[PDB]
């Protein structure tokens, strides 16, 4: 029920002493969403640290990027401290300073109850491909759907008024469900619980409808989900069957199909056109390699979209033993990074190769010592 965070500390750009840069701490794969992330400078907390809006992956685990602007010098040493319910003590990771395709629109919703601390926390984010473009936070000041990409700011007040009305309704719904789910599972009004909703549509390179999604999760575990055919549901336990029958009797799936197949597609197309300078670009990865037993590390920087495959081979066959693959991470400027590692005998590193499959490369690339 609880997943511990994966921590990465890195800079946006390669570090150059005296050159302005950005220090990143990417925490991913954790549950619940409660996390304390600090950026340290010489055993001291960095004052003005910003972070990205809460979002989560297919497995429902959350991810966050904490970042600040800094100018590294010779003496300064940096790190990231992370506290979480799955940790006996805060974990510190030091900044190792010596180190043609489909499209999609996705909406992610998260609600977390706060017994005896006001209404539940509601965070909503919108994505086109790997670019976030809208957000809503119940704790923010605006109480409005807010832009997070240049190309969405062209929309007029009718758009923003409607999105705010709709997102607030998503919020009210999740508030009711939080109490409902508390009753169905016989839990006390003192514990904190998380409800996660996610839906969206996929289109091919021809912008025609491909797939649609609508999924629901309670405390990180699957609750109910729309099948791939968008005409039936998938319940997870005895509690979710009650909602399934209440939704099949209300023919809810028919309404969702129309949105995913029509409205969702229609506005995804409009977004892709309005932000073509951004969304329809492909940044090829700037690739590189780092190095009786030795370590070989294949890297990939400043690429978009995030979809990428780094695989290892020993004399032709995919070696998946003694290999380390790290989660793709955001650079903070819209691009992404990733690397992979493998143990090798110092002297046999020529019988090893790294394969880079990316949507922005003419053909797969090959790298060896």
């Amino acid at each position, epitope marked *: 029920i609880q997943r511990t965070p994966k921590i990465q500390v890195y800079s946006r750009h390669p570090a150059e002493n005296g050159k302005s840069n950005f220090l990143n701490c990417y925490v991913s794969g954790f549950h619940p969403s409660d996390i304390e992330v600090d950026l340290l400078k010489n*055993g001291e907390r960095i004052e003005k640290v910003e972070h990205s809006d809460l979002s989560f992956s297919k497995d429902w685990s959350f991810y966050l990027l904490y970042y600040t602007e800094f100018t590294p010098t010779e003496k300064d*040493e*940096y790190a990231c401290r992370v506290n*979480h*319910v799955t940790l006996s003590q805060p974990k510190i990771v030091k900044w190792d300073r010596d180190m043609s395709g489909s499209h999609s629109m996705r909406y992610f919703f998260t609600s977390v109850s706060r017994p005896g601390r006001g209404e539940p926390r509601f965070i909503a984010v919108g994505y086109v491909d790997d670019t976030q473009f809208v957000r809503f936070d119940s704790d923010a000041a605006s109480q409005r759907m807010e832009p997070r990409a240049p190309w969405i700011e062209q929309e007029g007040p009718e758009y923003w008024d409607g999105e705010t009305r709709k997102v607030k309704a998503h919020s009210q719904t999740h508030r009711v469900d939080l109490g409902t789910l508390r009753g169905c599972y016989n839990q006390s009004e003192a514990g904190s619980h998380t409800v996660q909703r996610m839906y969206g549509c996929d289109v091919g390179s021809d912008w025609r409808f491909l797939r649609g999604y609508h999924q629901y999760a309670y405390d990180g575990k699957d609750y109910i989900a729309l099948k791939e055919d968008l005409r039936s549901w998938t319940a997870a336990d005895m509690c979710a069957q009650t909602t399934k029958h209440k939704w099949e009797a209300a023919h809810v799936a028919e309404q969702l199909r129309a949105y995913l197949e029509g409205t969702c597609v229609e506005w995804l197309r409009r977004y892709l056109e309005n932000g073509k300078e951004t969304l329809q670009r492909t940044d090829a990865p700037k690739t590189h390699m780092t190095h009786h037993e030795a370590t070989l590390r294949c890297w990939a920087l400043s690429f978009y979209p995030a979809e990428i495959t780094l695989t290892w081979q020993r004399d032709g066959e995919d070696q998946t033993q003694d290999t380390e693959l790290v989660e793709t991470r955001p650079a903070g400027d819209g691009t992404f990074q990733k690397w992979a590692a493998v143990v090798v005998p110092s002297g046999q590193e020529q019988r090893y190769t790294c394969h880079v499959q990316h949507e922005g490369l003419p053909k797969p690339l090959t790298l060896r010592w």
Partner: nanobody, 115 residues
């Protein structure tokens, strides 16, 4: 490499107060930030308060206003004045310190109990 000597725990009545103190050994230039985390009923320990050598403080939300952390100019020693204590503040309070290279040191901890 560094030792953290703690003192000032014990039992107190609700509404009462306590002063913790934590003194670091080793080089005076080998510790920057000092403070206290406290044990939760579960697995984790939460931030209570800490302070940098320069006096920059941060408090956990649940102790804001009631708890005050201070530092002695000379000796690497910090002081936690815990006022208006409630039963929910019962916990083992762990002192900690950060090296100027972001290395963490932790003390044994001191039980605090509020009837």
């Amino acid at each position: 490499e560094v030792k953290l000597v703690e003192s000032g725990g014990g039992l107190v009545q609700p509404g009462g107060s306590l002063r913790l103190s934590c003194a670091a050994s080793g080089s005076i230039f080998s510790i920057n930030t000092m403070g206290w985390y406290r044990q939760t009923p579960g697995k984790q320990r939460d931030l209570v308060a800490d302070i940098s050598s320069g006096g920059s403080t941060k408090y956990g939300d649940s102790v804001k206003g009631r708890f005050t952390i201070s530092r002695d100019n000379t000796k690497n020693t910090v002081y936690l004045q815990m006022n208006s204590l409630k039963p929910e503040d019962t916990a083992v309070y762990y002192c900690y310190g950060l090296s100027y290279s972001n290395d963490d040191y932790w003390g044994q901890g001191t039980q605090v109990t509020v009837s």
